[PDB]
Design a protein around this ligand. Structure first.
Ligand SMILES: [Cl-]
Ligand SMILES: [Cl-]
Ligand SMILES: [Cl-]
Ligand SMILES: [Cl-]
Lengths: 353, 353, 354, 353
């Protein structure tokens, strides 16, 4: 299942009750999984191995009630939508959508179907809207040229978002590959106490990176040890309830790369590594016109959040592997789930259980 | 009718043959205009006042033969698609599409339709593709909530790209507003001689910014003079044949803001001002594995290009006004074309012309 | 003097009482001018035409009580000191120092002299300090290789800082050139009302850029009209405001300064170090703060007036740097003449603008 | 000794002959170590524990013959000089100097003493010069307030620059602390073959970060294993390579340096000044060049090996800075022990290493 149930300890901070990004009160996650067909690749028909994942900053109208946010592009061989305004205004005003590289257009169409329905004032009595869509390429297993994600799928994922969500090869992670093993959706969280108050840092990742040899789990070179085992980009979403300004949240997003690096993420040329981070502490009203007060921790005290963020991403990445199920896709390509029995053998070998 | 016609001098460099971005050998522009209905607004129905404009770096295959590119975001209240990879790899691998803010999704779909058709390897034997889509909000005259742009329109605009192209309220500029006058597409070019060699700098703009009183034409406060005339963001595309690296083209893109400002562009909070610059000098092969030789001017001699960029952008913005025609739209809104007759009296009144 | 007293109107917002960056209550400016020698250049000796200019965000301890700040590099052919931390932490914790390109090291030394004197805990019980120094190249008139600026000059400039301050060829502006006329220090301010509240936007510029023919004053190509005026042969913009704004917002404000620059004929040529630094006096950040703080800040949807006021203050500030500059000779008998004001009135009149 | 020879294997790429940044031919490194006094801290007097370290891109005039370069700021709690021009022009035109935070002004004076002496035209017939200076805070062991570094020390460090240089507590690393052990200069190199051609990637670090328990060596939690080990109580990474690359590409390589940092337990806490500077010796840019030049550059699609190698070089270099450091006492009788070699080899073996 997850790292802890296998005796694998990542970091020093304790996890949240769910040990998921939803440990941040109000955060919701929904999926729509699309699996169909088997065999030779039939460009435009299948096999289909993809889906949609939605992340909701909170339970209400994200456009009317925005949240401060930040983001960092470790390597831009990615096709994200909406980061420019996010950086300019420091806010997120729509649910966060994740899907495959060739379905971002479709995703935007679906995300808008949802947004416009919730806000009929957009484009008439008020301004436009900044849909936020990020992705990963699931071409190894999925008929990506087919663009099998439908606009209704995006609305469905949003409406399905809940506190508890499945991990592994579901939603946007359905046909993803990592370390030449089955990748996908992974999640984890951490609790930290700063000047008396307890804050939560959650992480949800869409893993689809690394060569088999790069895999590093709790410092153990499992990847190298699994060199010839059969079967032969990443979006990191960070959420926290700690009060932070948009500038600070860009700092937070950078730290996600620390957890990425520790699992063997080298950010090769073609790996779209991007991190988005937001806080639920300050809600920005779309129509506000008077001076406001933004609650924020002084930078001198947020180091714990920086570390917890690295820890969260690192385990989240590992969890996407531990939760993934073996899978076959286009052209009979197969991606086996990281072999858990062999993994335990290796962890004990390097005395780390 | 353009600046020259009225006898208005902008800058000191001479224009190109056509005085259009297409003066840069190989560059082509195509439009698709959507006009329909009138009267009160009927969301999802009309009146319709929008379209699509496409800019092709060269007449070949853009994905297979990429061109170095740079870009600058003056104010990010914009929803551009594809800038992250552009900055990361310093290249543009698809035609450039412009349209309205709420149709970027559809634009992506339409662009992918064309791209996938031209490249069968994408998503099968090679990686994905980074569609480049920029936009401006035409809500004042257009039923933007209706998303009347269709994916076929994108493909059509591309197939229509030609050396010669219309300006004013066409393509993406169909329903645009500028200085509370009719805005839209505007273009211009300049020739510069650097160390014996002649280079061309072209600019195409999609004007949709400024208050009435902001308008500055060749230094004259035209906006203030016509403050009482009835009718009460911007994308700048820069092209050149001068050899430049991706870093240098980021610099070039910034210089376009010099021209924007001179016409009275202040980059208000809600104005999405973005500039993208590319060179036709170096062709980057998608499948290249051998060391290459990138041709580039030393930075100490490119100041003329920085200037020419500002000039073309400034005149292009003015041209979009001079080439626009009066038009009515949703809720009976109307944008008058800048009265050229009155303009002349004002110019002459300020010692100009 | 200033554009106002000449009838030259720039922008639509009204200026502050003094029409200087110090109209932002608490802000202070001090100068140290170095002029000596004449004739042939004797590298290391003179002629000397340089100086130092200090800008204090407020009147107390800037390190212990920081101000939120932002900045934008239009063209990085510049050697600024202190911007990386400004961007990372969003704050300014030292007075702002301007001087010539090759004196930045000396400026840092002097600035630290002042700072360590005022804070004995630095380097012992607390962290270090991020000195903020910016510059322009005055080589055309100054023996820049000689590094005539002395560390004490930096401390002096800081202790001379106050509300009233001279403009033109003084302090860091002493040996600068702009549009092939004498350049230097220029300043101006604008008042704006946002949601029933008055806010001031002030600007101080160190002009040292432009070709003679680029000069644009209130839309009039004053540069071309004065093509043949004798003397033929880089810029830092400091923005201050009392409006509450976060670091991110102050980076936005910094960018708007370029609009004003462009309007006077600034094209940011290859070798022109064009940089803008913006800060607010509305939110003071205590060095040792540990409790959650409340940052006062205007919603982005209502700050466009500040963007315009910024561009305005910068545009006039640049012109004032020319109007306030007095003719000056320098190394190798090089000379830059002050923009002829009576001539300027004539040109403005010919274009029906006065 | 260094890691490689101790038997500690980091990464999968082989190291250069010296396993130092100078394996990139032409690069040199010089130090000036200042050690004086002991006991209680007498501000401005001592004890002195600091110095200067100079890195030369090549053997000639760096100003007249510049090298292309890039840089990345992981966390800006640093006071670097020269990065703005580096990013704008993509070049380095002076030797690189490292010293303590409060000595940056002195380093500028010193570096300028050297440059102006070697370049008589600067400030007279040509432009100015961009001094490159970076730093770390050695206040725990050194009387930093005293600014004991003198301008002559800088000129000296530059002239002592050699292929063979000492590591550990020398030069700018003299008084540095890492993981609450002795820190300082560390270096390593990796050789990678790309398209039948071998390139070298070297790295020199100045370590001054991390809490005891953060220490990660070859994936082993040595930090936690030495939690209660005595002596309890930022980082600049310099990357060099002979691979041909543009400024943009070198900014990318600079970023990869953080991967190695993270893997040793670098979390970039709030007050940690973590910065990477990368340059190539492949292309020299003539100061007075006025004609179209040809930049030799490797296509991005084939540079991933350099990205991983950069990660490895930094990771091992950080470790070598610890292995080469010697125990030291300083101001206020503070002491920093060198990582216990025998105990470390013991801990490693205890984890199958
Ligand atoms: Cl913010
Ligand atoms: Cl490039
Ligand atoms: Cl902030
Ligand atoms: Cl370059």
């Amino acid at each position: 299942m997850k790292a802890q149930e296998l005796g694998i300890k990542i970091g020093v901070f304790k996890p949240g009750k769910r040990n998921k990004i939803t440990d941040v009160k109000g955060v919701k996650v929904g999926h729509v999984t699309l699996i169909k067909g088997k065999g030779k690749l039939i460009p435009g028909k299948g096999p289909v191995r993809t889906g949609v994942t939605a992340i909701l900053p909170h339970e209400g109208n994200i456009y009317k009630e925005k949240v401060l946010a930040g983001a960092f592009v470790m390597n831009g061989y990615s096709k994200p939508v909406g980061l420019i305004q996010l950086w300019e205004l420091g806010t997120i005003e729509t649910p966060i959508i994740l899907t495959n590289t060739l379905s971002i257009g479709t995703a935007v169409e679906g995300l808008l179907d949802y947004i416009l329905e919730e806000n009929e004032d957009i484009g008439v009595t008020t301004g436009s809207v900044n849909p936020l869509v990020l992705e990963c390429n699931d071409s190894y297993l999925n008929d990506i040229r087919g663009r099998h994600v439908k606009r209704e799928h995006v609305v469905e994922a949003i409406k399905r978002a809940d506190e508890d969500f499945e991990e592994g090869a579901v939603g946007a992670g359905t046909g993803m590959s990592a370390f030449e093993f089955k990748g996908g959706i992974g999640s984890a969280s951490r609790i930290v106490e700063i000047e008396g108050k307890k804050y939560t840092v959650g992480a949800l990742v869409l893993s689809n990176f690394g060569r088999r040899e790069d895999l590093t789990i709790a410092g153990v070179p499992v990847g190298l040890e699994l060199k010839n085992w059969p079967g032969r980009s990443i979006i990191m979403i960070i959420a926290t309830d700690a009060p932070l300004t948009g500038r600070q949240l860009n700092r937070v997003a950078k730290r996600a790369i620390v957890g990425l690096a520790r699992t063997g993420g080298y950010a090769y040329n073609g790996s779209g590594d991007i991190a988005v981070a937001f806080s639920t502490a300050n809600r920005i009203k779309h129509y506000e016109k008077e001076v406001i007060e933004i609650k924020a921790l002084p930078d001198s005290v947020i180091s714990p959040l920086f570390k917890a963020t690295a820890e969260a991403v690192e385990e989240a990445i590992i969890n996407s592997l531990l939760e993934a199920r073996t899978m076959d896709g286009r052209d009979n390509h197969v991606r086996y789930a990281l072999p858990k029995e062999e993994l335990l053998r290796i962890m004990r070998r390097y005395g780390r259980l």
